[PDB]
Design an enzyme around this catalytic site. Sequence first.
Site, PDB file in Angstrom:
ATOM      1  N   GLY C  10      -5.191 -12.869  -8.045  1.00 26.71           N
ATOM      2  CA  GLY C  10      -5.347 -12.566  -9.521  1.00 26.71           C
ATOM      3  C   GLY C  10      -4.045 -12.618 -10.344  1.00 26.71           C
ATOM      4  N   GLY C 143      -8.398  -5.413 -11.831  1.00 24.21           N
ATOM      5  CA  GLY C 143      -9.200  -6.579 -12.219  1.00 24.21           C
ATOM      6  C   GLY C 143     -10.313  -7.113 -11.214  1.00 24.21           C
ATOM      7  CB  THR C 179      -7.427  -4.860 -21.507  1.00 21.27           C
ATOM      8  OG1 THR C 179      -7.195  -5.781 -20.260  1.00 21.27           O
ATOM      9  CG2 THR C 179      -6.235  -5.303 -22.537  1.00 21.27           C
ATOM     10  CG  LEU C 252       5.245  -7.620   8.574  1.00 23.13           C
ATOM     11  CD1 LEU C 252       4.181  -8.424   8.210  1.00 23.13           C
ATOM     12  CD2 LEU C 252       6.287  -6.998   7.480  1.00 23.13           C
ATOM     13  CD  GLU C 254      12.127  -1.356  12.434  1.00 23.88           C
ATOM     14  OE1 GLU C 254      13.195  -0.494  12.565  1.00 23.88           O
ATOM     15  OE2 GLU C 254      12.330  -2.431  12.456  1.00 23.88           O
TER      16      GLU C 254
END
Lengths: 423, 53, 437
Positions: C10, C143, C179, C252, C254
């Site tokens: 996005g 979004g 928005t 990752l 850890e």
Amino acid sequence: REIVHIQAGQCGNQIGAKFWEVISDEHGIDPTGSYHGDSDLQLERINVYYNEAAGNKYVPRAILVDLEPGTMDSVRSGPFGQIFRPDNFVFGQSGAGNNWAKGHYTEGAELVDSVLDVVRKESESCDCLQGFQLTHSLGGGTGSGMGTLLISKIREEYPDRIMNTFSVVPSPKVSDTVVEPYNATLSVHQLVENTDETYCIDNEALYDICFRTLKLTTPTYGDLNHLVSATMSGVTTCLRFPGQLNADLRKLAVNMVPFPRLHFFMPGFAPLTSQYRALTVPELTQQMFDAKNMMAACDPRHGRYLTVAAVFRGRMSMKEVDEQMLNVQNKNSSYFVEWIPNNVKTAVCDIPPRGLKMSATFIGNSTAIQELFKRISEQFTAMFRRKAFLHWYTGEGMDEMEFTEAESNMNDLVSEYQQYQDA
Amino acid sequence: MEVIELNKCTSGQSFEVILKPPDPSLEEIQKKLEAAEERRKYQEAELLKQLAE
Amino acid sequence: MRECISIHVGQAGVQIGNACWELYCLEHGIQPDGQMPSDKTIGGGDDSFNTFFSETGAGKHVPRAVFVDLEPTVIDEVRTGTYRQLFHPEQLITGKEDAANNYARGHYTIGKEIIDLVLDRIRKLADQCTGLQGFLVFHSFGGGTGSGFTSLLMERLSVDYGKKSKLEFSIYPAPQVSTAVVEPYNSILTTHTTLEHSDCAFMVDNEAIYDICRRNLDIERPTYTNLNRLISQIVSSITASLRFDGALNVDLTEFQTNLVPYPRIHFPLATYAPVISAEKAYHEQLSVAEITNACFEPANQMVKCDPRHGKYMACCLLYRGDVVPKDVNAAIATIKTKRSIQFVDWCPTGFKVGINYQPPTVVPGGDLAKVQRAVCMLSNTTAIAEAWARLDHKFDLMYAKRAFVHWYVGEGMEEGEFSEAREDMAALEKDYEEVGV
Ligand SMILES: Nc1nc2c(ncn2[C@@H]2O[C@H](COP(=O)(O)OP(=O)(O)OP(=O)(O)O)[C@@H](O)[C@H]2O)c(=O)[nH]1
Ligand SMILES: Nc1nc2c(ncn2[C@@H]2O[C@H](COP(=O)(O)OP(=O)(O)O)[C@@H](O)[C@H]2O)c(=O)[nH]1
Ligand SMILES: Nc1nc(NCc2ccc3c(c2)OCO3)cc(-c2cccc3[nH]ccc23)n1
Ligand SMILES: [Ca+2]
Ligand SMILES: [Ca+2]
Ligand SMILES: [Cl-]
Ligand SMILES: [Mg+2]
Ligand SMILES: [Mg+2]
């Protein structure tokens, strides 16, 4: 991306033409369709409303409809009349005699297929059609009856596209015939079912603005239509210019419409012009929320706001804009429903309209709009209880039952607005 | 306040300081997406039946 | 060496990705054409920066990244901008029509038609890894695409790479730049559906970044460019341990081991200091003690909340620049005697500390001043649950009237999913209270 525009009947075609003049001027397109502007911001999203033809020509994506020729001859002779594509003019000869049944069931039905052929040819060549806008009045026969017929057929063939209207609501203060309340009640019934957004433009309010504020003893249709065209320009600015926002008609609809039937919006405009004193941001903010700038003759203090959009155009301080929008919300908090947080949204576009340094356009989804429908309902009932003038309609094949059902639908819409106003 | 497990390289060092002791399968996902699509089909057919009336 | 693949979903995710990859190029000395003159191994290697960049035979260093959006206008700016040569075209994926801020349209209607293509391009990147660790996923809560497509994607990545770690970077919604009214619906629906599929998630509240920019950078009205440059500094602080030599947070797994003992409570609070304006004539430089103190002021947090009224479960201090351990320990000793830092009873009271000697990089002509030393704190504190309370309250207000629900039902979602998601949030708030009080 692409939008298809449709204008039907006398009122629809006059205000439509004025709309195309104003926005063609903003994009630097002259009456021959040649670009003579000074800035790439004018062309970067030009394709939303204009097709490109050979020779770097820009042609409005516009279809022109009537059951009589007169007004489309006046368009073709009008100042920008040569810019429209000749194949997009679709007109009959019979007329509809200010009669919704002629527009919807007899005279109109003969023409509707040929109108749809042109709609299909325009859609077929769109890279990615976002949807449709229609201009029309509700008080006559062609715009009212045939316009709502068209709306129904388009939904049937393009059921997942957004359908939007700019709809001029009748008033006894500015009236052509006595049957206008019948034609309007029949049309609202259709809009409740088949549009996503309808801008309620009341000839009562336009008249009062020309008379009281702009000082005009005898307002013409031209004077009323100048305000209408300026409002419509304001409301399409955010799609038409590079203003950061990544939006399409569906995202706007999702932000503005909390319940499917309650989709009738109240427009406003500031400053009101027929001067030289530039206008401070506090002044734009105070005037855009003032009852006297509203294009539907309803008191917003008689209801509550479900949602609000504000669009500012011109060079100005965003800090000051935020401060003033916050000020009005904080000091007038009781008129905004507490169960939809952050329901006021603000846009700023750098490019001002012609002849102004600073301007604001207002779009309100308020429960006070029930006042308009009650008005019409009372005028309807005063005749219908004595069946006055009904023979014009039953002679075209309609039964009384259809009138009773339309009246009931509109009283239900009023009751719904009241339910959400007391919550 | 005990300082333990110091490590060192050319780009930096690390250590620890102690102040005090004490899934669904593919088939189900596919089914769910197809059920939603079927509901959308049903609503669309009801609309088109209204329009034929 | 083990590779790391980034996915940007996005508008918010794509633009934040742009800011992060620009900064990584400046830190590693990679030019916009992809060349890296300091790299003497042409066409390959197992250096630390190779976790994030692959190499062509021509010496081009290519990000391990996928950009996904359901409309084309934001990714086209990547295609035509300064770093267009950096990315392979098959890395840049766009649809034709967006989700119009509607979770159901992203998750069900449109996601169903693009998900297999996206997984295929991800598979293309995975086949080039010799020891793939997992994924870093960037998106908004608000979004239609960032919420709904991301949750669909997370389910499928759990299916296709069930052994792999997954980290999130999540943008929490703020009315000062938002928005749409329906952002609370989308936030609750996506958090519910993603919670079992994410190992560790860093939430950034746009309100905190906005106020830091106004207060400390003297910007009257911050834009997305300002916000994303600051956010990118924080993201870079978090991933530096994956990209440079070092012994803390080198993979990752850890992150979970050090920060998340309770798997559902996996939302650490980030705090960053110092932020100083480039236009500010002379800046007297802040010592280790002062910047480590600044980690305990709410005004410097990525989510506004009050850690004095919760409990800590873990804490990490990540220093960049001119920093030695002696000064860190002296600062910590001072701070403990002055502030309210209370840990849960079953966890030790302590800090894991990492130092990289290269000072922070800044973007030339930007709003941030160059400083000799900076710090990012990552703390797992129960006080972050205040943000869930705020979002849940707003949800309750709208759902009681069924406001806007028809937009979701018309895309084929059932009304029951709303209340399943809400009750899962109710259980989450309960977990944080039981742990914290
Ligand atoms: N920090 C930051 N927030 C952003 C940015 N762009 C959008 N947002 C926020 O994201 C939320 C809206 O989500 P978007 O990313 O715009 O929506 P989307 O994922 O593209 O989904 P669609 O509705 O299909 O367009 C709002 O709260 C925005 O303020 C950005 O560049 N930086
Ligand atoms: N504002 C505005 N109202 C109009 C205009 N022309 C007609 N009307 C109003 O529209 C209604 C008449 O409908 P009309 O457009 O003439 O019927 P049609 O040609 O059959 O569609 C009445 O309420 C008129 O007061 C116009 O140019 N501007
Ligand atoms: N619903 C809605 N709102 C509008 N106002 C402005 C706005 C700005 C930012 C917003 C926002 C609304 O909503 C969330 O963020 C214009 C329109 C429109 C209608 C019909 C035809 C149109 N051609 C171009 C536009 C448009 N439609
Ligand atoms: Ca005939
Ligand atoms: Ca190498
Ligand atoms: Cl695998
Ligand atoms: Mg007439
Ligand atoms: Mg988008």
